[PDB]
């Protein structure tokens, strides 16, 4: 079974370099072109280049102005993409992909975030039910980098839950809200707690959300 497994998420400052790996298995590594493609909102899918591991010839999209280097280790069937002089606009999901009349096989993707921001855990604020259905939530604010995980009542509460995609604020920090709709008649009896985890800052917060 053809498999392409990439290295994990990266967070870099502008000016730095990132090197992402792609471990290939289930086929003869030296006989197919391996390409790199990235995806981010606003530029969409963008082709970066290829390597042919049989002779380690590589070719690049001229738009990257020499910033991309693709290499391959035949002994371990691993390809690498290094992107240098990073800018915030290089924030994207990076994929490796095996070519044959298109791209039949893809790696899982590697998120690379490029920002001047420093690691910071979220502030978690209640969105109190006030004003037969009540809405309540938690505002998960001013964290970096992505992602955060949010659950309600330790995962016991999933119906009616909406955790919105994060937005990047002008500060360079992310924010989102998670909300849930519940019966107004439950507000006096049932406890509602949002559980927020931000692994990069070692933040684990449980915030009880009560009527005001």
């Amino acid at each position: 079974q053809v498999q392409l497994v990439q290295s994990g998420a990266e967070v870099k400052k502008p000016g730095e370099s990132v090197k992402v790996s792609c471990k290939a298995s289930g086929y003869t590594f030296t006989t197919y072109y391996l390409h790199w493609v990235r995806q981010a909102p606003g530029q969409g899918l963008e082709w970066m280049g290829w390597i042919y591991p049989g002779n380690v010839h590589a070719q690049y999209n001229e738009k990257f102005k020499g910033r991309v280097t693709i290499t391959a280790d035949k002994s371990t069937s691993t390809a690498y993409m290094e992107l240098s002089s990073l800018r915030s606009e290089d924030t994207a999901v990076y994929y490796c992909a095996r070519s044959w009349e298109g791209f039949p096989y893809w790696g899982q993707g590697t998120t690379v975030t490029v920002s001047s921001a420093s690691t910071k855990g979220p502030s978690v604020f209640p969105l109190a039910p006030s004003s037969g259905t009540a809405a309540l939530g938690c505002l998960v604010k001013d964290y970096f980098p992505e992602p955060v995980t949010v659950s309600w009542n330790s995962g016991a509460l999933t119906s009616g839950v909406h955790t919105f995609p994060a937005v990047l604020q002008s500060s360079g920090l992310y924010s989102l809200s998670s909300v849930v709709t519940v019966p107004s008649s439950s507000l006096g009896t049932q406890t509602y707690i949002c559980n927020v985890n931000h692994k990069p800052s070692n933040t684990k917060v449980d915030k009880k959300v009560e009527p005001k």
Partner: protein
């Protein structure tokens, strides 16, 4: 470089419908065109190679046609698993280039949002900033106008919206609009209101509060 332009950028359809997506290349690309399906969080999946050939195992309801500059992907009878974003790509010439994508969403009956407003928490106010959140819950279609007013004056440039993907139970959207101010500014005004216009509402619906109750 060759620009690949897809039409439409999004469409709403029902299960069983015929769906057609077109892709126009800015210069001839022969038949060196591929189509992909992508779902959230996942890599694209190859559907069609060399303009008209289904990739191994792809269901017969998917078909591709065209050559030169004009390409078409057809789904003859849409199934639940087919709601996704679709992309074209050329591999005729360097750099390889992709279309911008066409999102295929689920059609359903109009549903007006329930609207809720949340003042800044006392906790947040302690810390120097004020966020006011307006929630639109379970509406359809996606198009909605959310306008903030402070002391009855229309706002601009100080709010950000976020929208969920279509709900897996009822095919609706939910949306947050967040107004962010300095605490100093927040405390200068009395009335905070979000006004929502949507196809499902006979007239706009306003939710508001008076600062400090």
């Amino acid at each position: 470089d060759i620009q690949m332009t897809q039409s439409p950028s999004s469409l709403s359809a029902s299960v069983g419908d015929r769906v057609t997506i077109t892709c126009k290349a800015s210069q001839n690309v022969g038949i060196n065109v591929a189509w992909y399906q992508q779902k959230p969080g996942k890599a694209p999946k190859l559907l069609i190679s060399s303009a008209s050939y289904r990739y191994s195992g792809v269901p017969s309801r998917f078909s591709g046609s065209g050559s030169g500059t004009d390409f078409t992907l057809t789904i003859s009878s849409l199934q639940p698993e087919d709601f996704a974003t679709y992309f074209c790509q050329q591999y005729d010439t360097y750099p390889f280039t992709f279309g911008q994508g066409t999102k295929v969403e689920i059609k359903r009956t109009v549903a007006a949002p329930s609207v809720f407003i949340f003042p800044p928490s006392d906790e947040q106010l302690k810390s120097g900033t004020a966020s006011v959140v307006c929630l639109l819950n379970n509406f359809y279609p996606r198009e909605a106008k959310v306008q903030w007013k402070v002391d009855n004056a229309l706002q601009s440039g100080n709010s950000q919206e976020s929208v969920t993907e279509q709900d897996s139970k009822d095919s609706t959207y939910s949306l947050s609009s967040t107004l962010t101010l300095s605490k100093a500014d927040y405390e200068k005004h009395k009335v905070y209101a979000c006004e929502v216009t949507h196809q499902g509402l006979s007239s706009p619906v306003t939710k508001s509060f008076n600062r400090g109750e």
